[PDB]
Ligand binder design. Structure first.
Ligand SMILES: *[C@@H]1O[C@H](CO)[C@@H](O[C@@H]2O[C@H](CO)[C@@H](O)[C@H](O)[C@H]2NC(C)=O)[C@H](O)[C@H]1NC(C)=O
Ligand SMILES: CC(C)CCC[C@@H](C)[C@H]1CC[C@H]2[C@@H]3CC=C4C[C@@H](O)CC[C@]4(C)[C@H]3CC[C@]12C
Ligand SMILES: *[C@@H]1O[C@H](CO)[C@@H](O)[C@H](O)[C@H]1NC(C)=O
Ligand SMILES: [K+]
Ligand SMILES: [K+]
Ligand SMILES: [Mg+2]
Ligand SMILES: [Rb+]
Lengths: 39, 992, 268
């Protein structure tokens, strides 16, 4: 917007962290699954 | 020091009984005086063995703390505390950087110390096992009276008494004996009881009957003797010292480790000081000049590599534990793969160590029995009525019995009370005719004449199990020729017939052939006594010939031997196909040694000794060109008068070598001879007479079930199930781990470049620091760890058992070709991918690449809270630093992303991924966990403080993707060239 | 030689020359495409400069400006940087209707010169006289520090509204058009005096938004002179200058995030 362009200097680092941690966890689980296919 | 002990012993068995007493101030009848014995005790010292001085574990741990990488990491750790000290004095720095980084680095050294300490293990209790062979007490005659004393109180000169069941307390001169037999397997590896008597019977004291040795035991009878040697001075006490004293030495794998440590340490100190001066010339304060150096150290040293090696070794040892192959020393996991020569004991190693029936001669025909443990062969005969007649004599004319409670275990494995030949016959009949006890119940023995030294035969009279007869049957066995002189008829295919010169000659032929096979041959015959001349109550006199022992019916011959283990012939061939030379080294007699050599394939068909040529051509052995003989059989008595140079010529000039009737020191000498030629040697054995050889071997392998305690103490590896096929597996595993270590090392080293280059450009370019010191440790200690380990699970790219053993002088674990690829090619591509993401982060925040050159001065200036970017905006100190640390984070993640491709390319040295596939589940696990770790380290809240890791925007993750892909393509194209032309260019330049 | 023969030494050179040449050519290619995705007038991200920093002229050794009044070369270090900044706000530097403009001598509202486009020439910036900075060689005794708000493209600094309570409660509250700056230390052993545009202790909103170096060169950002004529002497005084606003925030880590950290000591 014009004088109300506050969103330009903002970033949702909170969501990014939530998503990043979700991904890291799921990649960790997936890895266990493939490894445990025989121990 | 031990050169004296490598020599054959000198003795006094040639002296008379009386003469021997003068030498030791002793009485043959009364024995020593209580006072004289105590005097000699203080004089000579105790009848005991002293363990050699060991190196304390303290010094062993700390010796690892100073090996190249640890030295550089120490210089870094201290240089951290240096810069910290210089700070705490000058400008009060409330930070924790240099202090904490110095603590972290010192911990890395200590923990890395534990890993190398675990790898360099030496579990040795040789002298302890020997000490277990000295009895607690001994029986001596002192002041004309026998008393039990502490065996350590035994001295040279006293009168000792032994009987069946006790250990020889010391080396004795036999002066009196009654039916005494002894088990000399300690000195020979052969357990057949040897008679002991006062009479001298051989110039060689290790063969004479009037000497009994410490480390052996009396098996039966009784004997008295004069002690000639005590403690360390006994024949086997010296073997003990020799074995326990032998310098261990460095393994092939250990030598390789130290070698690349020098290389990497070299480049580290090079670039280290090369840029330390390069910085001072650029006008950098010593305050900074050291900070850069610390970074250089951390970049160059692969912090997690030595521990990777250890884990890869451990994991390989775990797989072998699961095939009944125990590894006592982690490094011995690889030595077997580098082995070019095997020196093998015969008895209990190549062989089962059990007299077993091998052949039978009946119906004018040679039949072969199955000698294998698990009986993997086939039948020979069942139909012939002759067989049942021979079978009956083998069961009936036999005094051997199975021990109680064995019905659970297989026939051939069960313990038997009796001599070896009777046990063999027992197990033979029990196997192919069912319960022998049944045959001995159906035919009650009424009278017998046990085998006599003079008779050379054993006879028995039984009540024929037949109801229509129920009469008296005579059976006998003995020396083949003696049995022949007592026969008139031969049971041919059922019906008897006169013994014509024809069948008599066929007998001699059969007899000579079986004997030529190194087999012990016995004759078997029976005689159905006439009914009218022998009533149902007729008494037979065993003392005086009350019955005919002539004109009997010859039934057949039976031959026996201590046979090879089932898997042994095939394992020997497999070792030989892998280009490993196999030598036999045995305490056993030459005829037996040679026969098993041919049986297992040590001596291949057609190959001759000089003696074979001479007999065939009917010419003198001196007339034979010795170069025409590729095979040789060396008796220990001849070995004794040969110099090592002459032993070296024997080793060089023959492909098929048998060393027979060797002493324990002689086995050591043969091993050393092989090593002297530059060969990596394995020893396989099971007896205490293998202990020195096992110790000296680059790798000693002991048998687990049949092995003596001493042998297993001297070994690096134990075959817990006595499965000789495990050697073949071991060499295969050893070769595979050697290749996979290269892959894992290249992988680990490759990521050093993207950690070095940022520090260099930081100096030469004056740009903001692309990657931090902490960030490097997150890679080498964090992300790269599981992937690097996973390479240990790689399958072979080709048939590794088809290639020759590596040349330890030329074929190195880390060579110039590895460095060229890891440092010069792939690592260089990784460095760029790192920098790219760095320029991306900065440029998208307002600092375009052009304006970055020569800005670090203002960038690092803590007091300038208004640096102008390319767009004209002003940044505080902490604001721009957040972007900088975000650059460290994405550079870090870029390494991870480019290591994805590197992990896949390091999978194979030659083959394509499209050929080898992706069947390594640990590797895939590594990829997922590596990425999970990196994401966690970036996105987890609080990690921006502890590690200076900042959250990355999604687009950031993809910066290095095009570089990750170029790596995959590049290496795939390169290896395509290797395969397409075995010529050499790409091969001799980059082929690891 | 060391490794190989001359023929081999050559081939290994011909390879690495072509190899590294290609790699350099590829690296440059990826840099090209990166630049191609970026604007010339505005950076892709601005969340890392977001809350504006407040920086001053006196180059602090360590957020500190200690000196002796009874000594000449004791403050000549801080006067060097003070001069460096103010030397830019010269009238001879601001000449003609291009590219400067005379703007309200009193704090006014924002000025939009269109978009971040080159569809116009150099966007005309408001003039600023260093003569608006009353009282301030500089203050040889009791310094005359000069404040500054960090430039951010397209940033509209918004003052706080007088809805509730305020630190400098309602005094000279030019609510609509001034971004205030109140310095503080309890520990009240000083004498705060502020100088600026229109005589206000803030930043005139008529200098915003900043259009960037590419679209606005020679642009001048508003200054706020602060004088501490403290009646005290020979002691470290921790003085913090804070700016207030809707788009202004602070951090415990970044001690320059919309605030000062000055340790004055007139040890004379
Ligand atoms: C910006 O203004 C300052 C004001 O002090 C100028 O400083 C002048 O320097 C000259 C020569 O050194 C002196 O004779 C004057 O006394 C100073 N003041 C004035 C008001 O003229 C400085 O030169 C100016 N800078 C530029 C680039 O124009
Ligand atoms: C950051 C940049 C400027 C550094 C570049 C370093 C280059 C020149 C280095 C890195 C790795 C190096 C190579 C690594 C391996 C080998 C194989 C060896 O048998 C001869 C030297 C040779 C061929 C090296 C020559 C120089 C080399 C290519
Ligand atoms: C600042 O200077 C003016 C003259 O320009 C003078 O009248 C005034 O006293 C000075 N103010 C202070 C607080 O010293
Ligand atoms: K050994
Ligand atoms: K590394
Ligand atoms: Mg043996
Ligand atoms: Rb490293």
């Amino acid at each position: 917007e014009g004088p109300d362009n506050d969103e330009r200097f903002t970033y949702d680092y909170y969501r990014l962290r939530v998503v990043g941690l979700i991904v890291a966890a799921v990649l960790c689980v997936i890895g266990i699954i493939i490894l445990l296919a025989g121990k | 020091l031990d050169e004296l002990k490598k020599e054959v012993s000198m003795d006094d068995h040639k002296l008379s009984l009386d003469e021997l007493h003068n030498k030791y101030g002793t009485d043959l009848t009364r024995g020593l005086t209580n006072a004289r014995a105590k005097e000699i005790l203080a004089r000579d010292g105790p009848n005991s063995l002293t363990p050699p001085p060991t190196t304390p574990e303290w010094i062993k741990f700390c010796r690892q703390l100073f090996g190249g990488f640890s030295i550089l990491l120490w210089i870094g750790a201290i240089l951290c505390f240096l810069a910290y000290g210089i700070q705490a004095a000058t400008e009060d720095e409330p930070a924790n950087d240099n202090l904490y980084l110095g603590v972290v680095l010192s911990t890395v050294v200590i923990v890395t110390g534990c890993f190398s300490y675990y790898q360099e293990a030496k579990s040795s209790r040789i002298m302890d096992s020997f000490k277990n062979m000295v009895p607690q007490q001994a029986l001596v005659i002192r002041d004309g009276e026998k008393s039990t004393i502490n065996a350590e109180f035994v001295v040279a000169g006293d009168l000792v008494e032994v009987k069946g069941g006790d250990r020889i307390p010391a080396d004795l001169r036999i002066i009196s004996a009654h039916g005494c037999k002894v088990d000399n397997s300690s000195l020979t590896g052969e357990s057949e009881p040897q008679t002991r008597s006062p009479e001298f019977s051989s110039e060689n004291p290790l063969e004479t009957r009037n000497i009994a040795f410490f480390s052996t035991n009396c098996v039966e009878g009784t004997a008295r003797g004069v002690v000639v040697y005590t403690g360390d001075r006994t024949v086997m006490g010296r073997i003990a010292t020799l074995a326990s004293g032998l310098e261990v030495g460095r393994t092939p794998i250990a030598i390789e480790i130290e070698h690349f440590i020098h290389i990497i340490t070299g480049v580290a100190v090079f670039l280290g000081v090369s840029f330390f001066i390069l910085s001072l010339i650029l006008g950098y304060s010593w305050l900074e000049a050291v900070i850069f150096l610390i970074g250089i150290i951390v970049a160059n040293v692969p912090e997690g590599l030595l521990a990777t090696v250890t884990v890869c070794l451990t994991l390989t040892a775990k797989r072998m534990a699961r095939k009944n192959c125990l590894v006592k020393n982690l490094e011995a996991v690889e030595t077997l793969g580098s082995t070019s020569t095997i020196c093998s004991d015969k008895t209990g190693t190549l062989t089962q160590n059990r007299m077993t029936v091998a052949h039978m001669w009946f119906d004018n025909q040679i039949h072969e029995a199955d000698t294998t443990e698990n009986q993997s062969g086939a039948a020979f005969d069942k139909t012939s009525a002759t067989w049942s007649a021979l079978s009956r004599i083998a069961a009936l004319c036999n005094r051997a019995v199975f021990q109680a409670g064995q019905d659970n275990v297989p026939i051939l494995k069960r313990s038997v009370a009796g001599d070896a030949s009777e046990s063999a016959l027992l197990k033979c009949i029990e196997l192919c005719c069912g319960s022998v006890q049944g045959m001995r119940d159906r035919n009650p023995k009424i009278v017998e004449i046990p085998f006599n030294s003079t008779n050379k035969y054993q006879l028995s009279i039984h009540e024929n199990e037949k109801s229509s007869e129920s009469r008296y049957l005579l059976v006998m066995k003995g020396a083949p020729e003696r049995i022949l002189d007592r026969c008139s008829t031969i049971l041919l295919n059922g019906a008897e017939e006169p013994l014509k010169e024809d069948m008599k000659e066929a007998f001699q032929n059969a007899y000579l052939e079986l004997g030529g096979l190194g087999e012990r041959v016995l004759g078997f015959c029976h005689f159905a006594l006439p009914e009218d001349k022998y009533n149902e109550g007729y008494p037979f006199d065993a003392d005086e010939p009350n019955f005919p022992t002539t004109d009997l019916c010859f039934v057949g011959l039976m031959a026996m031997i201590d046979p090879p283990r089932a898997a042994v012939p095939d394992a020997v061939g497999k070792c030989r196909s892998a280009g490993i030379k196999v030598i036999m080294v045995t305490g056993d007699h030459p005829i037996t040694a040679k026969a098993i050599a041919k049986g297992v394939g040590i001596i291949s068909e057609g190959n001759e000794t000089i003696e074979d040529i001479a007999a065939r051509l009917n010419i003198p052995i001196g007339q034979v060109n010795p170069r025409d003989a590729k095979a040789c059989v060396v008796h220990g008595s001849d070995l004794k008068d040969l110099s090592t140079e002459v032993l070296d010529d024997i080793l060089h000039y023959h492909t098929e070598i048998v060393f027979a009737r060797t002493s324990p020191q002689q086995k050591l000498i043969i091993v050393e001879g092989c090593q002297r030629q530059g060969a990596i040697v394995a020893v396989t054995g099971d007896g205490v007479n293998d202990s020195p050889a096992l110790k000296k071997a680059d790798i000693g392998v002991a048998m687990g079930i049949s092995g003596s305690d001493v042998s297993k103490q001297a070994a690096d590896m134990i075959l817990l199930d006595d499965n000789f096929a495990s050697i073949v597996t071991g060499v295969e595993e050893g070769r595979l781990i050697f290749d996979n270590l290269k892959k894992s090392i290249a992988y680990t080293l490759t990521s050093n470049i993207p950690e070095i280059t940022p520090f260099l450009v930081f100096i030469i370019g004056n740009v903001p620091l692309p990657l931090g010191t902490v960030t490097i440790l997150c890679i080498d200690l964090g992300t790269d760890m599981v992937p690097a380990i996973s390479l240990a699970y790689e399958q072979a790219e080709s048939d590794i058992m088809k290639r020759q053993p590596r040349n330890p002088k030329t074929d190195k674990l880390v060579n110039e070709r590895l460095i060229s690829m890891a440092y010069g090619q792939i690592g260089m591509i990784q460095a760029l991918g790192g920098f790219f993401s760095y320029f991306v982060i900065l440029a998208e925040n307002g600092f375009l690449p052009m304006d970055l050159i020569g800005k670090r001065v203002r960038w690092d200036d803590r007091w300038i809270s208004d640096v102008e970017d390319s767009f004209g905006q002003q940044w505080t100190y902490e604001q721009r630093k957040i972007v900088e640390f975000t650059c460290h984070t994405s550079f870090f993640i870029s390494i991870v992303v480019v290591q994805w491709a590197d992990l896949i390319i390091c999978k194979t040295r030659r083959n394509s991924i499209f050929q080898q596939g992706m069947k390594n589940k640990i590797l895939i696990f590594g990829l997922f966990e590596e990425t999970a770790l990196a994401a966690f380290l970036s996105y987890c809240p609080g990690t921006d403080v502890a590690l200076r890791m900042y959250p990355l925007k999604p687009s950031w993750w993809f910066c290095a993707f095009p570089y990750s892909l170029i790596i995959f393509l590049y290496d795939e194209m390169r290896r395509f060239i290797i395969r397409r032309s075995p010529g050499g260019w790409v091969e001799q330049e980059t082929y690891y | 030689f060391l490794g190989r023969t001359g023929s081999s030494w050559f081939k290994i050179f011909l390879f690495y020359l072509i190899f590294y040449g290609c790699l350099a050519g590829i690296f440059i290619g990826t840099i090209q495409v990166l630049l191609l995705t970026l604007s010339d007038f505005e950076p892709k991200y601005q969340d890392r400069v977001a809350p504006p920093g407040l920086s001053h002229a006196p180059y602090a050794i360590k957020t500190e400006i200690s000196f002796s009044i009874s000594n000449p070369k004791s403050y000549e270090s801080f006067v060097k940087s003070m001069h460096k900044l103010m030397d830019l706000y010269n009238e001879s530097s601001q000449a003609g209707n291009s590219p400067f403009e005379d703007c309200s001598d009193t704090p006014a509202d924002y000025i939009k010169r269109g978009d971040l486009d080159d569809s116009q020439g150099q966007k005309k910036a408001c003039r600023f006289s260093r003569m608006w900075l009353k009282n301030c060689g500089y203050a040889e005794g009791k310094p005359c520090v000069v404040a500054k708000l960090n430039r951010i493209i397209g940033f509209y600094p918004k003052p706080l509204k007088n809805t509730t309570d305020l630190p400098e409660e309602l005094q000279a509250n030019y609510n609509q058009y001034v971004l205030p700056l109140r310095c503080a230390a309890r520990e009240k052993i000083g004498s705060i005096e502020y100088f600026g545009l229109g005589g206000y202790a803030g930043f005139p909103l008529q200098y915003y938004p900043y259009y960037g170096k590419r679209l606005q060169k020679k642009y001048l950002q508003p200054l706020l002179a602060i004088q501490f004529t403290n009646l005290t002497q020979n002691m470290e005084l921790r003085i913090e200058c804070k700016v207030y606003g809707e788009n202004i925030d602070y951090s415990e880590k970044d001690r320059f995030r919309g605030r000062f950290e000055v340790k004055i000591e007139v040890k004379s």
